[PDB]
Structure formats: C-alpha cells, structure tokens
Short mmCIF file of C-alpha atoms and ligand atoms in Angstrom, two decimals:
data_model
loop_
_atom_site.label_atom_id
_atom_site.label_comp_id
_atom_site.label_asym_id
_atom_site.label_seq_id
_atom_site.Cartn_x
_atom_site.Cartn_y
_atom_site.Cartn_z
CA UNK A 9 70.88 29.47 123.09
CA UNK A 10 69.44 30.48 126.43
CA UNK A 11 68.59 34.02 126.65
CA UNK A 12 69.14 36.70 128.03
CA UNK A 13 72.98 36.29 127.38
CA UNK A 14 73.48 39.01 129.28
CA UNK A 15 71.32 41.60 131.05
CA UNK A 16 71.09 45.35 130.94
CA UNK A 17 73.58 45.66 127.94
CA UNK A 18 72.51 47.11 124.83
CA UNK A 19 73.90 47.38 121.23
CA UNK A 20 75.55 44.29 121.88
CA UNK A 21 78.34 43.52 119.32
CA UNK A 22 80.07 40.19 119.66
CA UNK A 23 83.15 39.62 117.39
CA UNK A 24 84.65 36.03 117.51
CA UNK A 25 88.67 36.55 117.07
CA UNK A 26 91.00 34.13 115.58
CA UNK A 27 92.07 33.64 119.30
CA UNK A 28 88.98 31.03 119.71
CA UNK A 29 87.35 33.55 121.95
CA UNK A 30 84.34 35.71 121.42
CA UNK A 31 84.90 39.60 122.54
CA UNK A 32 81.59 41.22 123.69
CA UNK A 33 81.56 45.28 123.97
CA UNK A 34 77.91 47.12 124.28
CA UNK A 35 76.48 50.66 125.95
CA UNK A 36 76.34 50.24 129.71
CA UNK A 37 73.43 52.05 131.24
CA UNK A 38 75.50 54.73 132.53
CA UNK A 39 76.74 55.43 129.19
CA UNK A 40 80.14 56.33 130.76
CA UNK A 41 82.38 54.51 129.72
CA UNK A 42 83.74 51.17 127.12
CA UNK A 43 83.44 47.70 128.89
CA UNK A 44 84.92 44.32 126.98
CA UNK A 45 85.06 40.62 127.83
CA UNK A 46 86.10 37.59 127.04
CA UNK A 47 85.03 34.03 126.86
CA UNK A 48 85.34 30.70 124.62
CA UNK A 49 81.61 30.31 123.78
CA UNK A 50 78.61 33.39 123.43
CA UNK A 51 76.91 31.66 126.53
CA UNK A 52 80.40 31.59 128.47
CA UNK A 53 80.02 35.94 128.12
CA UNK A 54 77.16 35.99 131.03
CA UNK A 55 80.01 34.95 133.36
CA UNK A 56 82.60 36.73 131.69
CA UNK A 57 83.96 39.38 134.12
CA UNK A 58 84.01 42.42 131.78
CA UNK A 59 86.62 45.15 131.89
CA UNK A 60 86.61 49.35 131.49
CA UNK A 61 88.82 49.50 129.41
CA UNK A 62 88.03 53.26 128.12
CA UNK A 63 86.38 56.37 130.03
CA UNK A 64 84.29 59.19 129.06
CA UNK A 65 86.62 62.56 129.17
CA UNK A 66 85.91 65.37 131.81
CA UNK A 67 84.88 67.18 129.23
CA UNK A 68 85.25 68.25 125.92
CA UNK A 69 84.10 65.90 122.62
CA UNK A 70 84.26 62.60 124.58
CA UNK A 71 82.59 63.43 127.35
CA UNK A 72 79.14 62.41 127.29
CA UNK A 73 76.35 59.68 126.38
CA UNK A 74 79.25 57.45 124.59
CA UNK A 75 77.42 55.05 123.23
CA UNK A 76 77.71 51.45 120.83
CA UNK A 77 81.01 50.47 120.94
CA UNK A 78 81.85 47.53 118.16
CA UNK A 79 85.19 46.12 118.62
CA UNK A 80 87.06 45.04 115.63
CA UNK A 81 90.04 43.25 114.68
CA UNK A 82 91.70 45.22 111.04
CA UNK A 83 95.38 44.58 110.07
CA UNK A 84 96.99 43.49 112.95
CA UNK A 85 95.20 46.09 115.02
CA UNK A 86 92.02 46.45 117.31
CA UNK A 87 89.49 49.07 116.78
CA UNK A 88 86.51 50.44 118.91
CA UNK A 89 84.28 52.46 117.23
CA UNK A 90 82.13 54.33 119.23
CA UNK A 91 80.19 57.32 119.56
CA UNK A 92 79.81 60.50 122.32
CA UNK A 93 78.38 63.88 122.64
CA UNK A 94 80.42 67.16 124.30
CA UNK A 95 77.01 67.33 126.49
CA UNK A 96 73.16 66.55 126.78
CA UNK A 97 71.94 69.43 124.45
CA UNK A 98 69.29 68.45 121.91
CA UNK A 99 69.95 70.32 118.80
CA UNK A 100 67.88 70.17 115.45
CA UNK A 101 65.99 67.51 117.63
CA UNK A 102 68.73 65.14 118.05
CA UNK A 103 71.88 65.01 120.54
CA UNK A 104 75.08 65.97 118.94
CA UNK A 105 76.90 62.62 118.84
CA UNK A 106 80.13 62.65 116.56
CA UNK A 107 82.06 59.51 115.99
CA UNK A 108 85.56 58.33 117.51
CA UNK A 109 88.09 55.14 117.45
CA UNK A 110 90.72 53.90 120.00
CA UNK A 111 92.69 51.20 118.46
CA UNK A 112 95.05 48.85 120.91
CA UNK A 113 98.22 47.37 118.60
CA UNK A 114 98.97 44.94 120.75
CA UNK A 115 97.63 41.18 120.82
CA UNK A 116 95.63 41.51 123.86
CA UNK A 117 93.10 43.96 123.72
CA UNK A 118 92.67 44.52 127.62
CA UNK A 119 96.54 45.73 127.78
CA UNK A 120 97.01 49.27 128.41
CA UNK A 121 97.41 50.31 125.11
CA UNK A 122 94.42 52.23 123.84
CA UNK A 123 95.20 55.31 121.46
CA UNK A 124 92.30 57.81 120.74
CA UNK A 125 92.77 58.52 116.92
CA UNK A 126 90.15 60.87 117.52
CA UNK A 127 87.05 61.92 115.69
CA UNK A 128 86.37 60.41 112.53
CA UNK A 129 85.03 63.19 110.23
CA UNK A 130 82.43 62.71 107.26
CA UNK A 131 81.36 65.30 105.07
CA UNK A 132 79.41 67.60 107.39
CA UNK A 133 78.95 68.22 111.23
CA UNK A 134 75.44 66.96 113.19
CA UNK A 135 74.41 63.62 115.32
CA UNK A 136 76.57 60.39 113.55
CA UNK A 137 76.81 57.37 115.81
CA UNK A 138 76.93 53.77 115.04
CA UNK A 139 79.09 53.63 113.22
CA UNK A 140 80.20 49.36 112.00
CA UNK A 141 82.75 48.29 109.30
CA UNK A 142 83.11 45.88 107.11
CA UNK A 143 85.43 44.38 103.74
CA UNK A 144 84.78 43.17 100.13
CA UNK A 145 87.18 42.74 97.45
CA UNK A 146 89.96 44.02 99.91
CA UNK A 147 87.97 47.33 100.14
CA UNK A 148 86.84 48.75 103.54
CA UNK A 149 84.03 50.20 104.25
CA UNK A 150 82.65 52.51 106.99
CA UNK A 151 78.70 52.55 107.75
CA UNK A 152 76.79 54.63 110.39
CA UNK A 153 74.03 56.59 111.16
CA UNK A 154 74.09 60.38 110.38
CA UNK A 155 71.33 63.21 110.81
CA UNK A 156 70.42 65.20 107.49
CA UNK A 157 68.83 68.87 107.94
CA UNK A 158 67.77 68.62 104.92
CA UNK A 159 66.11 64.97 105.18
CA UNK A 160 63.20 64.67 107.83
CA UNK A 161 63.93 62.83 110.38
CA UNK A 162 66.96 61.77 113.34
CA UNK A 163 69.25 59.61 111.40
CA UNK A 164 70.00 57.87 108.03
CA UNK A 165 72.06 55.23 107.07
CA UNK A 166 75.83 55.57 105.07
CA UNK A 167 78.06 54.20 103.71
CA UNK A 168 81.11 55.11 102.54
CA UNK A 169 84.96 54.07 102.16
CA UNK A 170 88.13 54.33 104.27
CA UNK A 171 91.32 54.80 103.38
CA UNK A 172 92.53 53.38 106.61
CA UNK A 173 90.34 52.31 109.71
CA UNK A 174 90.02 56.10 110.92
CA UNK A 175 89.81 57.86 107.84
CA UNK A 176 87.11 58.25 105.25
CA UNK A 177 87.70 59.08 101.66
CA UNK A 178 84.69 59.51 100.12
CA UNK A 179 81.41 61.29 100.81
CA UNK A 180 78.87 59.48 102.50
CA UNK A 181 76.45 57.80 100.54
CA UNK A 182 72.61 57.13 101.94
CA UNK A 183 71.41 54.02 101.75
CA UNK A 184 68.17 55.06 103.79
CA UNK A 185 66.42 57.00 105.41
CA UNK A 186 63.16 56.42 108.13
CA UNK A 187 59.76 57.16 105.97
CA UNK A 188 58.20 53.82 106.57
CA UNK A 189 55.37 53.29 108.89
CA UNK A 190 57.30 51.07 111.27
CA UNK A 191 60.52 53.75 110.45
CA UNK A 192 58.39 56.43 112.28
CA UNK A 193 56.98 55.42 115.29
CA UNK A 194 57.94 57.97 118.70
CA UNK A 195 60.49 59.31 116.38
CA UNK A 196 61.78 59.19 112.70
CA UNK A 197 64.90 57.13 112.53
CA UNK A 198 67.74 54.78 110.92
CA UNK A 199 70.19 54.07 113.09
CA UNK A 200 72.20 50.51 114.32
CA UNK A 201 73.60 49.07 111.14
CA UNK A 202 75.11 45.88 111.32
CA UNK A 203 76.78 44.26 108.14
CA UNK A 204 75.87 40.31 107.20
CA UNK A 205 77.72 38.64 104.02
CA UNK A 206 76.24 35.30 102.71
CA UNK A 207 75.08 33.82 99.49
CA UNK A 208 76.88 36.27 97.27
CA UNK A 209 74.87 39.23 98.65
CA UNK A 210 75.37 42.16 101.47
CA UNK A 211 72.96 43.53 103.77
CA UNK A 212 72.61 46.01 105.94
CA UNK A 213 70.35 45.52 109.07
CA UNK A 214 69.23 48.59 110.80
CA UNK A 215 67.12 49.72 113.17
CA UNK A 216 64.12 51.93 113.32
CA UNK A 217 61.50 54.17 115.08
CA UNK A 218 62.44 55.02 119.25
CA UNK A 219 63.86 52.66 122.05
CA UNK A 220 60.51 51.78 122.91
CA UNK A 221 58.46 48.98 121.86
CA UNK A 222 58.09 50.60 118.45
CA UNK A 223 61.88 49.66 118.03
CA UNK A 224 62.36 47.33 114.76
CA UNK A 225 64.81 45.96 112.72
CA UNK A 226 64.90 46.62 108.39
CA UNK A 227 67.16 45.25 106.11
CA UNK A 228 69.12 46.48 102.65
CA UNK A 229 70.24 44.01 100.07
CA UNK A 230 72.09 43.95 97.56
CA UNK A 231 74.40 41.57 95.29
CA UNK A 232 78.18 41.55 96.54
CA UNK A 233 79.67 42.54 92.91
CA UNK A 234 77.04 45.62 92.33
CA UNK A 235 78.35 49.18 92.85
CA UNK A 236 78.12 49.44 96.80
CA UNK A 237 78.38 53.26 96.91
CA UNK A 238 75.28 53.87 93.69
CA UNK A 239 72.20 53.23 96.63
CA UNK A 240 70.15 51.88 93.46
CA UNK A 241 72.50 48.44 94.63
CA UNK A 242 70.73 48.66 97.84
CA UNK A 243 66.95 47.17 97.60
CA UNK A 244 64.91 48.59 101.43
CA UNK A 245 62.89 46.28 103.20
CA UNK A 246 59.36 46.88 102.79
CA UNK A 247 58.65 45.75 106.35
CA UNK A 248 60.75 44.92 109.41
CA UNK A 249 63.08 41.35 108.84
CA UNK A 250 62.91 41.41 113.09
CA UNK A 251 60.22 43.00 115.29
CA UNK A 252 58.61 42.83 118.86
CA UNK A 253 56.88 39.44 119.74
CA UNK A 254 53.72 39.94 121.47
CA UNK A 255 53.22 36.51 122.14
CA UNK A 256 56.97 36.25 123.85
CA UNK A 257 57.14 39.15 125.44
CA UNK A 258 60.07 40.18 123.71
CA UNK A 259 59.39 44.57 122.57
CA UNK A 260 61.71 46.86 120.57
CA UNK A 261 64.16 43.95 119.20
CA UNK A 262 67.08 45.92 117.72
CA UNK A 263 70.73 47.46 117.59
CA UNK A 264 71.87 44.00 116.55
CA UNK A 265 75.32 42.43 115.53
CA UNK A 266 76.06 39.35 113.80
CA UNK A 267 78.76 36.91 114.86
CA UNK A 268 78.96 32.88 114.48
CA UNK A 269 78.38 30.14 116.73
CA UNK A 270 81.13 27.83 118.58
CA UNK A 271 81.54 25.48 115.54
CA UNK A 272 81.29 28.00 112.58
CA UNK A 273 78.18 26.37 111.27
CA UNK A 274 75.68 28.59 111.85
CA UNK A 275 75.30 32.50 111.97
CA UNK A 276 73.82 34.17 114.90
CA UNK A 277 71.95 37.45 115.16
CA UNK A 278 72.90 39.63 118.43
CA UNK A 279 70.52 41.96 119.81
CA UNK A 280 68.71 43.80 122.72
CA UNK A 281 65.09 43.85 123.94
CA UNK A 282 63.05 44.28 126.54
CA UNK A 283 61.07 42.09 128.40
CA UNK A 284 57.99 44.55 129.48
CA UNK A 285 56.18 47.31 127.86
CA UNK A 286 55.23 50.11 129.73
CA UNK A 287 58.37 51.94 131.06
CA UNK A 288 56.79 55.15 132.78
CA UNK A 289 60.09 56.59 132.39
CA UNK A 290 62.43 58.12 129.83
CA UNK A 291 63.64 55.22 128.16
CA UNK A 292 67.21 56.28 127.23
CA UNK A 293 67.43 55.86 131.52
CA UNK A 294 65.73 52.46 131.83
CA UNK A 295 68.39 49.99 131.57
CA UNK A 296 66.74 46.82 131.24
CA UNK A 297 67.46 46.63 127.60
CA UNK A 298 69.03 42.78 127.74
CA UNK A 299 71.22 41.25 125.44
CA UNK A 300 70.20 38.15 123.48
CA UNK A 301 71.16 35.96 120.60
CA UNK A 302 69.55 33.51 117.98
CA UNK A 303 70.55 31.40 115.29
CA UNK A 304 70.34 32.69 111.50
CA UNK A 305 67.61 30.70 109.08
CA UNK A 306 68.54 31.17 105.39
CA UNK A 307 65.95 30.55 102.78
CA UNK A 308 66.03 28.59 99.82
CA UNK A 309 66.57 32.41 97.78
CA UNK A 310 69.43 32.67 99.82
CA UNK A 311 67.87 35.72 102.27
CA UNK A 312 68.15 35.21 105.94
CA UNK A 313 65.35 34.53 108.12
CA UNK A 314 65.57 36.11 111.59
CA UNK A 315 62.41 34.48 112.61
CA UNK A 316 61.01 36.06 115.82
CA UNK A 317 62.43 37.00 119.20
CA UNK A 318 62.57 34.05 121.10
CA UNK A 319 60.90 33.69 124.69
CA UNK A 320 63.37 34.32 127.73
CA UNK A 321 64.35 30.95 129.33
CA UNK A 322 64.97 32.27 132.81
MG1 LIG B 401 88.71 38.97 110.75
MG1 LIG B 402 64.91 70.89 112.55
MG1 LIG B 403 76.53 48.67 116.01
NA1 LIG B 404 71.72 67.15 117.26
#
C-alpha cells in the first residue's frame, strides 16, 4: 500500500460493504461537518470525490467539533456514529462531546435519506465520543470513550450492549482507563477504539496520551466465548501494539480502524499520523494528520502484529 491514502483526514474508518466497494468517513479539519466516499479498492479512496453528506447544526447539541464518524452497515440499515459538542467550553478539563447516529435506510448511502436518531445516552452525562460497534454470537455491542469524575484522567474505554443500533441497555462497563506511562503523556487518555476479531479472540485497540507525537496505540484481549461485559475478560497491553517511528518519520500513529484488503486475504490496520514533529500550534487546528493503511501480521499465538508505521512513499 502506498501511503498517505489520503491526506489531512483523521480517525479514518474504512468499512468494505457487500457492494464490492470500500466506504471511507473520517474528521475533516474543520470539524464541521460528515464527508463519505466511495471506491472499489482502499488506494482507489485518494481519488474518490467525497461527499457532505451531514452538517453541524446552528446550534444546539450538534453544533460543534463533530468529530470520528464510523459508518456502518446493521440490518439492512446504515449508521454513522459520531460525536459533537453544543460549544468549545472545556469543562472538568475535557470538551463536552455527547454521542449521536444518523442512519440512511436506503441502499445507497449518499441518497438524501439521513435521520438523526439523536443522542445516544449511557449511564451518566460528561465528554463520550468514539464511539465503534461491533457483533458476537448475534449480540451487539457499543464501545466508546467516556470521561469519569471520579477516575483521573480525559477518557476511558466501554463497552456495553444495545438493544438496537441507537439504544444501550446496559451500563457501561470499563475496560480501561489511561495510567500507563505511554497512557499519560500531554494528557491522560483512552480514547479511539476500534474492534478486530481473529483467531477466536477480540480486541480492542485504542489510543492514548494527546494528538501530538506522544499519540499511541494499546490493545485489550480477550477470548471470544469469555464474559465480554466482566473487564477481568479483557487482558491491557503493557506497552503500545503501534507507536511513532522515529526512524520513518511517522509521530502520534493512532485513531485507527480495521477493514480488509481487495481480495479478503489479509487484514489491514487504518490510521492517522503525522509526518513532522514540532507543530508550534494547537494541534486540534493543525490538519496535517494523514490517513494511512498497512497490512495485519498475525503471530504464530494468534495476536496481531501491527509492526511499525511505514515510511511515506510520496
Ligand atoms: Mg457486515
Ligand atoms: Mg476535575
Ligand atoms: Mg473510531
Ligand atoms: Na468536559
């Protein structure tokens, strides 16, 4: 794969659709709005033209900072999951981010045809964004990132289950929470899950510490048949499974997806990084986050090797 796929997009989430064709949604710089395209192959997205197909509100919940769209396919339905603020307070140190879907019924998702089902609720009310889905055993399950006042830091990890794709019915469960060394760096946080099923296990990439170059990526495991919502199933990391590369010139590696490549044979790891390291500017404004892909290694124990941000071929 020659990278970058595509520049200045970050929290890139790819999801190949029984169509053939790979759908690519991400935050655009301006955080303003929900952008999708379209093309046969993950290279074929650079000259995809992409499409606002959502815009922030005037005001109100919806109006700000909307941020990591995934777009999904559930039950005959698409879903974008995505997350804004009512404004650009800071509040017990974070923004105040809630969650939100549109879902489009129809067959083609860039039809006119997107319903706000409106703010998915969890068990209390502070920054959640992030928020990715996924099934087992004809379950489904809803995992984000959610502040705790009562746990140090921005943002931990949940999980919990739906009763239907905008609707939780259980309490959130943590699966982590940023105490780590390389959790902690700029800022204390879990945020950017992104669900990968293989080899009879789960996991749970995340990502950690600011947008900088401190920016990581950690990993929970844990066997597909164990009790998802006990987090004694989930084993943490003990350092990152995908970090900066010095040597390539790749910093802060992280907000990835996971999709598969043209033939089905391999899995591929979606993410955004930079390309330089000192951005003399608040980096929520520097948009030269790019996104990137790479093939998935698996190890004889059945884990996946991410191996290391590869060097930008042009
Ligand atoms: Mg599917
Ligand atoms: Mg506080
Ligand atoms: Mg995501
Ligand atoms: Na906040």
């Amino acid at each position: 794969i020659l990278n970058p796929i595509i520049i200045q997009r970050a929290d890139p989430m790819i999801y190949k659709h029984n169509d053939g064709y790979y759908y690519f949604t991400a935050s655009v710089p301006e955080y303003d709005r929900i952008e999708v395209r379209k093309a046969k192959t993950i290279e074929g997205l650079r000259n995809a033209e992409p499409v606002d197909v959502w815009r922030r509100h005037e005001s109100g919940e919806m109006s700000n900072l909307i941020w990591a769209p995934e777009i999904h396919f559930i039950n005959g339905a698409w879903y974008i999951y995505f997350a804004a603020a009512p404004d650009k307070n800071i509040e017990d140190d974070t923004f105040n981010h809630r969650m939100f879907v549109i879902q489009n019924e129809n067959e083609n998702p860039f039809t006119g045809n997107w319903v706000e089902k409106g703010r998915i609720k969890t068990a209390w009310e502070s920054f959640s964004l992030d928020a990715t889905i996924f099934e087992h055993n004809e379950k489904l399950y809803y995992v984000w990132a959610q502040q705790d006042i009562n746990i140090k830091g921005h943002s931990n990890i949940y999980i919990a289950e739906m009763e239907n794709p905008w609707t939780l019915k259980t309490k959130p469960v943590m699966l982590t929470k940023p105490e780590l060394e390389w959790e902690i760096k700029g800022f204390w946080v879990n945020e950017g899950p992104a669900v990968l099923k293989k080899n009879g296990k789960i996991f749970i990439t995340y990502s950690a510490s600011a947008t900088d170059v401190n920016y990581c990526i950690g990993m929970l495991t844990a066997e597909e048949n164990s009790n998802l919502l006990d987090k004694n199933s989930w084993t943490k990391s003990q350092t990152p499974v995908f970090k900066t590369s010095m040597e390539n010139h790749q910093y802060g590696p992280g907000h990835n997806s996971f999709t598969v490549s043209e033939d089905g044979k391999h899995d591929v790891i979606v993410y955004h990084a930079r390309n330089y390291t000192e951005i003399k500017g608040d980096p929520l404004y520097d948009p030269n986050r790019h996104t990137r892909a790479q093939i998935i290694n698996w190890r004889e124990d059945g884990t996946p090797d991410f191996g290391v941000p590869e060097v930008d071929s042009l």
